[PDB]
């Protein structure tokens, strides 16, 4: 078991995200810096995310070693993931949500039953923490349950795009997204981000409190922009090149509105609306544990 | 949903349309044959007898 | 005491946009004998044909 370090688990070199810049490796932070914006004339007034259910999915014993990380990256991220909404995995996650618990969430992201000493883990009190939450995942698809898939996403923007000013505000002009860029950066990008292990992000998430959970949100608020980033590709209307003096230029339109588009295109990765549902469920949660 | 197919070039069709327009004494009747097949097919108009 | 040479238009001009060509088209005219009218539509006939 590896003890969570005192401002996160993020604060060891191990899990550091990275992303490649035209192939060359990067903090996302100076990523951030390619994007430029043209304000529309719409705006983006940010709604109240409603609390998220209380219900964790039940409990239920299931057969093998579920790999929760690469299940969340992939229905966030990856191309085409497929049946994201499965139950077992998340089954499993609240599972590791019980006081007592047997299962152990590893470093790899996998959830194993056993008491297994040979594969270090996070602290079970943390993922205790972190499954009490983000099992909710799992009714991501139930009619109960479902999470806004619009209005979320104004606070996708705000947390993206937004100035200080806006984000204080609460309320933002409708952007275009636009960076000097090379072919398939934006699905390379993804496929950067996908490869993040956001189980150190989400389990600092909910473990820290008071100045050590104050100081990891702003340490890594240009992480939690950069995943916000490939989610508003994965939904931008429209994604397009501009030839400017031989230097191509991408722009995405547009960021904070969610087009709802579910068919594939080259340009960005596309949710289907099994995706739009667990994603938008995704936001539910971890923006109501940002604006804590 | 993608349909593997070049993009409708808007801008190099209306030129290549206006040199045709330029050259080719044709056109002109191509495109009213087009034209008068779809009235033909709308059946809006046949000739009577009487 | 000069020196003629080709010079593209893309060496005058900023913008890309309006600049399809290049020296070479030039080059290759240069390599053309010097077409009548008649010639000239003979020759879009053949590439037609």
């Known amino acids: 078991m590896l003890q969570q370090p005192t401002g996160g688990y993020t604060t060891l070199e191990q899990f550091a995200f990275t992303i490649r810049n035209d192939g060359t490796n990067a903090t996302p932070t100076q990523f951030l810096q390619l994007l430029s914006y043209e304000a529309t004339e719409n705006e983006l007034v940010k709604k109240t995310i409603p609390t998220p259910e209380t219900h964790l999915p039940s409990a239920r014993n299931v057969p093998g070693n579920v790999y929760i990380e690469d299940a969340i990256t992939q229905a966030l991220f990856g191309i085409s993931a497929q049946n994201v909404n499965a139950h077992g995995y998340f089954s499993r996650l609240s599972a590791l949500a019980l006081p007592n618990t047997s299962a152990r969430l590893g470093l790899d992201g996998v959830i194993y039953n056993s008491e297994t000493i040979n594969i270090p883990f996070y602290d079970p009190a943390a993922v205790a923490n972190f499954a009490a939450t983000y099992a909710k995942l799992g009714n991501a698809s139930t009619p109960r349950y479902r999470a806004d898939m619009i209005d979320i996403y104004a606070h996708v923007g705000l947390e993206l795009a937004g100035t200080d000013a806006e984000r204080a505000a609460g309320v933002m002009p409708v952007k275009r997204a636009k960076f000097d860029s090379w072919e398939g950066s934006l699905i390379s990008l993804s496929r950067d981000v996908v490869n993040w292990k956001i189980l150190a992000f989400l389990i600092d998430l909910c473990s820290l409190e008071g100045e050590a959970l104050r100081a990891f949100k702003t340490r890594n608020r240009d992480v939690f922009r950069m995943m916000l980033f490939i989610m508003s590709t994965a939904v931008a209307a429209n994604v397009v090149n501009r030839k400017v003096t031989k230097r191509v230029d991408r722009v995405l339109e547009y960021i904070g509105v969610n087009s709802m588009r579910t068919a594939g295109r080259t340009a960005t990765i596309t949710y289907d609306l099994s995706r739009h549902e667990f994603a938008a469920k995704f936001l539910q949660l971890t923006f109501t544990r940002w604006n804590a | 949903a993608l349909r593997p197919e070049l993009a409708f070039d808007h801008d190099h069709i209306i030129r290549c349309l206006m040199l045709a327009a330029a050259n080719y004494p044709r056109l002109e009747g191509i495109i009213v044959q087009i034209n008068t097949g779809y009235v033909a097919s709308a059946n809006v108009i046949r000739p009577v007898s009487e | ?49």
Do not use: G
């Open chain 3, 1 to 49: 005491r000069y020196h003629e040479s080709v010079l593209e238009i893309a060496d005058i001009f900023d913008q890309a946009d309006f600049i399809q060509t290049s020296d070479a088209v030039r080059q290759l005219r240069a390599l053309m004998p010097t077409l009548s009218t008649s010639q000239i539509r003979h020759a879009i006939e053949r590439i037609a044909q």
